[PDB]
UniProtKB/Swiss-Prot annotation:
This is Antirepressor protein CarS. One of its GO terms (biological process) is carotenoid biosynthetic process. Involved in carotenoid biosynthesis. Antagonizes the transcriptional repressor proteins CarA and CarH by preventing their binding to DNA. Can also dissociate preformed CarA-DNA complexes. Does not bind DNA. The gene is carS. It comes from Myxococcus xanthus. It comes from the Bacteria. Monomer. Interacts with CarA and CarH.
Length: 86
């Protein structure tokens, strides 16, 4: 079947950790308990933001996920990593 845009992306909804297309830095130290040793010391962009999860989840993930350049993508917490200054 043809790939039709069944879902439409919206701007940053008030009440979020970071903004879409924003580059964050994966914190080295763990705040909750789970952390990525691979990303531990990297910098990626938030592919998905934590927003009202519909009956079909959105946008692409339920939580925020950082994707490193040339690396993979993992799911991190808003209390784990912070928004880079630069």
């Amino acid at each position: 079947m043809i790939q039709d845009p069944s879902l439409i992306i919206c701007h940053d909804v008030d009440g979020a950790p970071v903004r879409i297309g924003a580059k964050v830095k994966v914190v080295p130290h763990s705040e909750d308990g789970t952390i990525s040793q691979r990303f531990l010391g990297q910098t990626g962009i938030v592919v998905g933001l934590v927003f009202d999860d519909p009956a079909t989840q959105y946008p692409d993930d339920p939580l925020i996920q950082v994707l490193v350049e040339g690396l993979g993508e993992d799911l991190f917490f808003p209390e784990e990593l912070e928004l880079a200054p630069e």
